[PDB]
Design a protein around this ligand. Structure first.
Ligand SMILES: Nc1ncnc2c1ncn2[C@@H]1O[C@H](COP(=O)(O)OP(=O)(O)OP(=O)(O)O)[C@@H](O)[C@H]1O
Ligand SMILES: Nc1ncnc2c1ncn2[C@@H]1O[C@H](COP(=O)(O)OP(=O)(O)OP(=O)(O)O)[C@@H](O)[C@H]1O
Ligand SMILES: Nc1ncnc2c1ncn2[C@@H]1O[C@H](COP(=O)(O)OP(=O)(O)O)[C@@H](O)[C@H]1O
Ligand SMILES: [Mg+2]
Ligand SMILES: [Mg+2]
Ligand SMILES: [Mg+2]
Lengths: 469, 53, 486, 501, 128
């Protein structure tokens, strides 16, 4: 078929057809553009008109321009050739190394695995981060969330997770960057090339970057998540292998929909969000899943507008994750990095059956002592701390020691802290927290635990402070 | 001196509790005003969007 | 061309078809699109019809032909569903074959009147001490479970479902309770792990899991509670007892809001239409307790609500708080300081009250409630602890023990007689001479001990349903003897 | 459903078959002018976001392309347009002149000179609405942009190619930070290190013309105008001009970026570009969103700030730093637009209005000010001193609400905090900044009085600039503080301290 | 009528906080765009035009007069609400009736700290 543009309002273009009408979600190519402009159909308004969202800037469109219905939703290259490349929302490369020559194309819109196709196994996924491993252990095949305000550590933490896991992974990986800084996308690309994860010469790359950074008009930021998700879908199903999928950010996938919603003629919902927020996010988050025919260990960073965890967007996302690590601004102000909030990060495998009795007892002990400390701070506000009883001064001191010990230096933060990044296997974390709780370190100053790996390093640091005293 | 100190602390903390309650009165009134203002503002935004289309 | 029994889509988009024709279509009737897609006709307007599509509008072109099925939405029912996983319309989604149910019911039937009911009097045992003693739930009640994120609401529901296995495996027939678990707007993998968990406890031979997950179109999430409530009314109207758990009832409200705002109905507060009370009231008012002239069956309901930041003055939390006969708050501050289940017993209530407690649990919890009430008003001192008379000292030394008795673990509900025994030991005073940290151990020991040796006493308490002074004395002797050797 | 052009004056033309006589392809007639927005019937071949020219010299930018009419926005006051006026295309997407000719001119949003010194003799024109560089052109921010403000250069370093954000309440000193930055580059621009010249652009959005005139006078006073452009869309100017001024400035800077030169651009404020955009959208009957701001007021600023990049050496090595200025209301940095921009930039300088009275000027609220680029964009000498200084301030900031060790810590912290104050329009070379910071952080002021460091700073700076310029030149050229240079500084600091009292 | 025929009148509106509510109903039912607290932006002109008639004509205009005593009612004694301030900036004085002085039996409960009359000492009997 072939339609003609009839109205251009922002990023929303109406197209009138005289042949058959293109079903919803189809991709229509605008004829007469220097660079490929693709409009994804979004509504049938009657009178053989379709309302569509332009995947790229609608500068210089003219009423009456011609538009060809491609005949199928946005199709993107897939296969083991996209590894090491960079892709748009529409799949054409943006790293200037020639076309992505694949045999396989995939449509970015596809239903989710049926209930009869899900997996029910859960095995802890050691990450090397004390707080994450101790209080909210991740899981292989599970969906993971990093809820952060602005500037708390979402991106540094996700880069640490990439460095750690993606490098030591048998399978492939994918990093869909939805609507975040382009500086960061370039930084990640160069970091991978310089770290061997990507390889320009030969075919030995394990990452398939996809980018919809925040200069893309909303029609593009709202879809690139589906594109990265399609690449991961393929690697999960056709390759029949394990996959990782880091998304950063998954808020922009909602924000872009909100941006285009009003022009599509929808009454706005609670906080200006589109009325279809919950379903527009379920239809996406329900394709990021392990199944009997594969496995995806999805990690997602999630902006929390103004540190408001009750906002509709994060509030709705909380239900789609198997593990959340709520980074906090208050903890990051104390200098503890990562800022993970021990009394707000949760998990589904934190059970005495899945992680073991001792791990569970220690995690709950850490949480309980921190909560007791939170209660005590109210009293310490008025009385002063010399007035506290002797069973509580111990509680406060131990809680401060545990707060410090939860901090850790990452290998990707050497630019900031200068320290050397560390990995703390699970046993060291559990043993160190057991000991800190039991009282085996009441004789070391609390600052001895600040930004160290295993507990023995805290002992050595305390000794060095004493000597240099 | 011990008796005097304990009587003084009793009086001082009684006065502090009364000051805190007298402050919570005004803070609660302000909180209720602001809650109603937020509800009205969000509702007016919704209906002004609905009318505009 | 026919424009009475058939029509043609004028428009589509965001799941709201606008059909032209269908002049004889009834309101809330199930029409069928040419693409094998169903839909529900909600807006009947002079010029068109607003159909909500049960599925993806990718398959609904413009100009498609829509044919009315002639019937209001209806769902299968019967004991043929028990142990299955059905979706919002009765279709199986567990891949165990067809459902094979003879009967059917309308999702939108009306609740029983004022005469059919009778006052709630039987106890619905949840197997959770904090609930069974302090905030009891009768049969025919509607006890909201309202809480924050990850506070333990779904776990309360699943402990309730798992507990009924002892009754359902017995031979008494008026104690059997059949459970329905409507899971609204939940990740499918969550429902799959939940079905596995129920299978583990073998509690899936009398459970019907109705699944309206996140990917499902808004109408299915809007409609799942009514499907479940109809499958439960079937057991209510046949002398059987049911227990339906909506989880959550806030996501049904969100789906309904989406449909309304896309049908362009006047927004209202928080953009919720004017029917988010009518919507939930005409659902929760179907939990009844029929008198004997109507069978004697019953249907409990445990709607689950999530509150953002403990804000229970929001729109939907207050709508569903003014409809129900109680509420079980689950605060997270208590969750992290050891109190799990984190049932805040200050804010929790049950307007039915002790009218739905077994005489033994009444006998004991009547005084446990007062002991905790007294403890809760001198709780702040607990830190100071000393510098206070023996009166408040003993108050908050009894309160701590009583609190540590109410702690409980995942998926391990306790029989009513064992809860009564434990609370008896704790409140009669056979624990005030014990370090609080050890209380749990004592419990987990004492319980087992009583289970092993003195099964006859537990049988007598269970059957008599009362602590006869003979049984009272025997229990005191048992507690004293055990506590001596600890 | 009534089309805008379903009027009698148009349907009559249609009925009596006279429409063929007029051109309805490259020309149009104003259906209805009002409140600064024209609806135009015709222009069937007008491009979206194209410029059009009314029959009285006024220009407009065809934003809405509706099926039957065109929503045009007038870059002026619509007092002169009348229903029925003839609107004729211009043919080109709205574009602005660029070049080195603008340098030193108070140009206006559309490129017209409002300083009265004659026409801009520019040669090339750029579309305002151009896409920002991609993933490949850029590289990591490496060079330092010397702000000339002790606190910023020490604890909030800013590189070239980095988008900072000066956010704070009204009247806390944001424009002062911007003008210190503009004036500082004078020393580099008056030199031969062509790779350190920075060309400045100041976009003044919705500010009374008296303010812009005083600012231009201040810049001419320091003769910081030979390398400065000033895009002035003041309050009296129609909303479309205030909405387009940031893009005009950003394109004037993309010029210098695409030619191996380094530019700085300062939007002041962006919270008023957002207001102008909201007015435009509401007057085009576009549905509102939060606080009536159009639904896409994030994209408005993201597509602007994403153009501040740092090109690789295959693309010339140019650079465009951006310093957006936002104005919070009551320190409510958690508002809608402040939150929109805080997540678009990489770094942020928090001007607190109570640090501004407690004595600290500039009010920079260290601890809340961050620079995601970080030490990567700092000088080696400043790296060395700031490493200790930031840590000592970080410790002193948690024991400020008050032993011997901690008393020494508090004394040192107060000494530093008095060493971070500064005047106005008096930026300091990096060498002097590192000199005084080193003087204060080693401990050569642990005894002097707090109220006397404010004057010891000035006295010591005058002494070094008048006596030991060779040391400063060595530190600056070498970049780092060499051991012999460190010893020379030690000698100088102790000598001046002893003979200062 | 009296004011313009040389006589003296006194008009007591009781309350004017319940005329502005009737006007807000009248407006929202006309679909007019609600403002602060859902009141229309017109809710000032409504009271200003009404209370600007309580004049005191000079002797070349009869010499009559029309005193006015609007009665506003404030929820929780918030003097800074919308309508209370709309009217506090239209009138020549004010008499604050505290609800805690009243509950102490001090009646009438005028709060003399905040009450004021901006003609005050003028037009007061010399003895008083
Ligand atoms: N009685 C209990 N004892 C110990 N832990 C519990 C108990 N109840 C719940 N938990 C823990 O709390 C966590 C959350 O449980 P649950 O899923 O019941 O909360 P939820 O409100 O259903 O969560 P969501 O709101 O995300 O659906 C689980 O990991 C579980 O281990
Ligand atoms: N370092 C400083 N020392 C002393 N005074 C200062 C300093 N910086 C700014 N000020 C004072 O602050 C006042 C306002 O500064 P400036 O106008 O730069 O801030 P601003 O917030 O941009 O103002 P506005 O927001 O109203 O345009 C000026 O009068 C100036 O004298
Ligand atoms: N692990 C860490 N160690 C030290 N500093 C950190 C760490 N994580 C974050 N930061 C600081 O906090 C800032 C937060 O930036 P980043 O996490 O990259 O973006 P986001 O706003 O998405 O979290 C960083 O620029 C860095 O200065
Ligand atoms: Mg980030
Ligand atoms: Mg749950
Ligand atoms: Mg200013």
């Amino acid at each position: 078929t072939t339609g003609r543009i009839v109205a251009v309002i922002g990023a929303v273009v109406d197209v009138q057809f005289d042949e058959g009408l293109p079903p919803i979600l189809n991709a229509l190519e605008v004829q007469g553009r220097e660079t490929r402009l693709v409009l994804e159909v979004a509504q049938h308004l009657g009178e053989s008109t379709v309302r569509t969202i332009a995947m790229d800037g609608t500068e210089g469109l003219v009423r009456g321009q011609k538009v060809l219905d491609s005949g199928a939703p946005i199709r993107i290259p897939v296969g083991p050739e996209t590894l090491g490349r960079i892709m748009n929302v529409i799949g054409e490369p943006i790293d200037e190394r020639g076309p992505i020559k694949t045999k396989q194309f995939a449509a970015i819109h596809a239903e989710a695995p049926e209930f009869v196709e899900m997996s029910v196994e859960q095995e802890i996924l050691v990450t090397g981060i004390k707080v994450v491993d101790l209080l909210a252990p991740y899981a292989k095949g599970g969906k993971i969330g990093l809820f952060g305000g602005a500037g708390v550590g979402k991106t540094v933490l996700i880069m640490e997770l990439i460095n750690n896991v993606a490098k030591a992974h048998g399978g492939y990986s994918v990093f869909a960057g939805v609507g975040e800084r382009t500086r960061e996308g370039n930084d990640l690309y160069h970091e991978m090339i310089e770290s061997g994860v990507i390889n320009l010469k030969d075919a030995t790359s394990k990452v398939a970057l996809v980018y919809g950074q925040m200069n893309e008009p909303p029609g593009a930021r709202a879809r690139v998540a589906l594109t990265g998700l399609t690449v991961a879908e393929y690697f999960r199903d056709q390759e029949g292998q394990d996959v990782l999928l880091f998304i950063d950010n998954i808020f922009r996938f909602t924000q872009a929909g909100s941006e285009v919603s009003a022009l599509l003629g929808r009454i706005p919902s609670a906080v200006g969000y589109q009325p279809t927020l919950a379903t527009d996010m379920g239809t996406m988050q329900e394709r990021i899943t392990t199944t009997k025919k594969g496995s995806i260990t999805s990690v997602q960073a999630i902006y929390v507008p103004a540190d408001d965890l009750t906002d509709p967007a994060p509030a709705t996302t909380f239900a789609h994750l198997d593990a959340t690590t709520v980074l906090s601004r208050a903890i990051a102000e104390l200098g503890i990095y990562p800022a993970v909030d021990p009394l707000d990060s949760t998990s589904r495998i934190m059970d005495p059956n899945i992680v073991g009795s001792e791990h569970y007892d220690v995690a709950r002990g850490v949480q309980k002592i921190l909560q007791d400390y939170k209660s005590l701070q109210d009293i310490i506000a008025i009385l002063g701390m010399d007035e506290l009883s002797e069973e509580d001064k111990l509680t406060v001191s131990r809680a401060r020691k545990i707060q410090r010990f939860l901090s850790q230096p990452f290998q990707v933060a050497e630019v900031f802290t200068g320290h050397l990044g560390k990995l703390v296997p699970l046993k060291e974390t559990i043993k160190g927290f057991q000991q800190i709780l039991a009282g085996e370190y009441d004789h070391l100053p609390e600052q001895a635990f600040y930004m160290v790996g295993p507990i023995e390093e805290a002992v050595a640091k305390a000794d060095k402070l004493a000597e240099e005293h | 001196s011990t008796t005097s100190e304990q009587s003084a602390r009793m009086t001082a903390m009684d006065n502090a509790s009364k000051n805190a309650s007298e402050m919570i009165d005004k803070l609660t009134l302000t909180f209720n005003r602001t809650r109603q203002a937020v509800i009205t503002k969000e509702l007016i935004e919704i209906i002004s969007g609905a009318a505009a289309l | 061309v026919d424009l009475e029994e058939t029509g043609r889509v004028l428009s589509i988009g965001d799941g709201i078809a606008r059909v032209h024709g269908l002049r004889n279509v009834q309101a809330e009737e199930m029409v069928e699109f040419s693409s094998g897609l169903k839909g529900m006709s909600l807006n009947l307007e002079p010029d068109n019809v607003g159909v909500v599509v049960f599925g993806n509008d990718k398959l609904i072109k413009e100009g498609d032909i829509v044919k009315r099925t002639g019937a209001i939405v209806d769902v299968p029912v019967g004991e043929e569903l028990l142990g299955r996983v059905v979706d919002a319309l009765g279709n199986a989604i567990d891949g165990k074959g067809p459902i094979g149910s003879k009967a059917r019911r309308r999702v939108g039937l009306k609740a029983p009147g004022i005469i059919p009911r009778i006052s709630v009097r039987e106890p619905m045992q949840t197997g959770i001490k904090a609930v069974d003693s302090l905030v009891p739930i009768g049969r025919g009640q509607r006890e909201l479970i309202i809480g924050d994120r990850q506070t333990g609401k779904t776990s309360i529901a699943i402990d309730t479902i798992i507990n009924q296995k002892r009754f359902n495996d017995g031979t008494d027939e008026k104690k059997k309770l059949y459970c329905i678990y409507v899971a609204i707007g939940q990740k499918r993998s969550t429902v799959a792990q939940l079905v596995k968990r129920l299978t583990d406890a073998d509690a899936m031979k009398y459970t019907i899991v109705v699944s309206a997950t996140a990917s499902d179109a808004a109408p299915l999430q809007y409609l799942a509670p009514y499907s479940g409530c109809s499958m439960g009314e079937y057991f209510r109207d046949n002398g059987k007892h049911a227990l339906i758990i909506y989880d959550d009832l806030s996501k049904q409200a969100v789906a309904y809001r989406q449909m309304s705002l896309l049908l362009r109905r006047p927004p209202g507060r928080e953009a919720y239409p004017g029917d988010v009370f009518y919507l939930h009231s005409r659902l929760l008012e179907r939990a009844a307790k029929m008198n004997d002239a109507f069978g004697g069956g019953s249907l409990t309901a445990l709607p689950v609500i999530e509150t953002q930041a403990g804000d229970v003055s929001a729109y939907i939390p207050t709508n569903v708080i003014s409809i129900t006969d109680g509420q079980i708050f689950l605060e997270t501050e208590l969750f992290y300081k050891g109190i799990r289940p984190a049932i805040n017993v200050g804010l929790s209530v049950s307007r039915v009250g002790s009218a739905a407690q077994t005489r033994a649990m009444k006998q004991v919890a009547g005084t446990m409630k007062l002991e905790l009430a007294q403890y809760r008003e001198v709780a702040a001192f607990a830190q100071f602890g000393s510098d206070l008379d023996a009166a408040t000292q003993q108050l908050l030394s009894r309160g701590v023990r009583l609190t540590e008795l109410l702690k409980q673990g995942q998926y391990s509900p306790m029989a009513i007689e064992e809860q009564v025994a434990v609370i008896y030991a704790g409140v009669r005073g056979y624990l005030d001479k014990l370090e609080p940290s050890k209380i749990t151990k004592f419990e987990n020991a004492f319980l087992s001990h009583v289970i092993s040796q003195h099964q006859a006493l537990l049988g007598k308490i269970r059957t008599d349903g009362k602590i006869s002074e003979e049984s009272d004395a025997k229990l005191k002797e048992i507690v004293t003897n055990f506590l001596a050797g600890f």
